[PDB]
Design an enzyme around this catalytic site. Structure first.
Site, short mmCIF file in Angstrom:
data_model
loop_
_atom_site.label_atom_id
_atom_site.label_comp_id
_atom_site.label_asym_id
_atom_site.label_seq_id
_atom_site.Cartn_x
_atom_site.Cartn_y
_atom_site.Cartn_z
CG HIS A 156 -0.68 0.37 2.61
ND1 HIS A 156 -0.49 1.24 2.63
CD2 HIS A 156 -0.38 -0.86 3.41
CE1 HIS A 156 0.25 1.15 4.10
NE2 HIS A 156 0.36 0.23 4.51
CB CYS A 157 1.21 4.32 -1.78
SG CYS A 157 -0.59 4.12 -3.32
NE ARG A 158 -4.03 10.50 1.81
CZ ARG A 158 -3.72 11.89 1.50
NH1 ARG A 158 -3.20 12.59 0.37
NH2 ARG A 158 -4.91 13.12 1.77
N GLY A 164 -3.39 3.12 -2.47
CA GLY A 164 -3.33 1.46 -2.70
C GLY A 164 -3.40 1.60 -4.60
CB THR A 192 -0.28 0.35 -4.67
OG1 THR A 192 -0.04 0.71 -3.28
CG2 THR A 192 -0.36 -0.95 -4.19
#
Length: 282
Positions: free
Chosen positions: A216-218, A220, A224
């Protein structure tokens, strides 16, 4: 011709159509809707495909791109931490890749709990974080590594390797070279941990739904998806899988925003080109 502007515009045309088709309707039967009255989606327009959803109270999806099996999710909300840790534990997660930067996590306006760099207790689950190695990825980008030990009465204790790109650029895309280095690190980390489980005869090895890297990023969907695309190109089983296949697969299995920005698609195209991998399906 395969990688020229005509082919790239055609790829974009196909992917844009798919994004539109996959746009969520109000109370869309294809997307997970909140239960119990708790906020589910970090961003209202970035939803979780119901049929591939991992947990009823997370924005998170099983994704298979060619042969490559992962989980893509949003950065968990504070309220979701216990469920998120249970997901990580039940999946026997061989690597958790976090692509949100330290600056992003520190912005308390963003509501991104510092859940992997700190120890804590979340309902019934106790989590211990330990710092491990740090690996340079190129361009000054650094992967900070951790292990998260997740303990809960009635559950087997599970330790999860974490790869955190703490200085992921906030305003720009990372290069194909950095993406490649990151994919290799994430894959290698997952392989080592999976091997440990295999050596112990874990039943999780024979379960399609488990032993999946979690990324995940923020939201996703951007960094991502870029990472997941690079990982699938690292998988020797995926010969002939096109960029069109990989992006359409991420999209149908999570949401229409997967590979959110043209800048990210540029990187996947460059990686594909480096391999003589097709952009488009014939």
């Amino acid at each position: 011709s395969p990688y020229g502007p005509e082919a790239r515009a055609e790829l974009s045309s196909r992917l844009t159509t798919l994004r539109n088709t996959l746009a969520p309707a109000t109370n869309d039967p294809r997307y997970l809707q909140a239960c119990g009255g708790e906020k589910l989606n970090r961003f209202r327009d970035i939803q979780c495909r119901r049929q591939t959803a991992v947990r009823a109270d997370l924005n998170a999806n099983y994704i298979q791109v060619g042969n490559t099996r992962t989980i893509a999710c949003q950065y968990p909300l504070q309220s979701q931490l216990e469920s998120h840790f249970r997901m990580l534990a039940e999946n026997r997660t061989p690597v958790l890749a976090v692509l949100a930067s330290s600056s992003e996590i520190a912005n308390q306006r963003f509501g991104m709990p510092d859940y992997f760099r700190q120890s804590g207790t979340y309902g019934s689950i106790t989590v211990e974080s330990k710092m491990t190695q740090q690996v340079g990825l190129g361009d000054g980008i650094m992967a900070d590594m951790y292990t998260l030990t997740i303990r809960e009465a009635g559950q087997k204790t599970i330790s999860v390797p974490v790869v955190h790109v703490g200085n992921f650029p906030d305003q720009t895309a990372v290069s194909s070279e950095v993406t490649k280095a990151l994919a290799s690190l994430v894959d290698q980390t997952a392989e080592t941990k999976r091997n440990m489980y295999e050596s112990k005869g874990s039943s999780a090895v024979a379960d399609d739904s488990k032993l999946r890297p979690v990324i995940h990023c923020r939201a996703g969907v951007g960094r991502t998806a870029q990472l997941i695309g690079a990982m699938c190109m690292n998988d020797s089983r995926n010969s002939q899988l096109s960029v069109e296949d990989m992006v359409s697969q991420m999209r149908v299995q999570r949401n229409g925003i997967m590979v959110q920005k043209d800048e990210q698609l540029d990187v996947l195209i460059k990686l594909a080109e480096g391999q003589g991998r097709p952009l488009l399906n014939s």
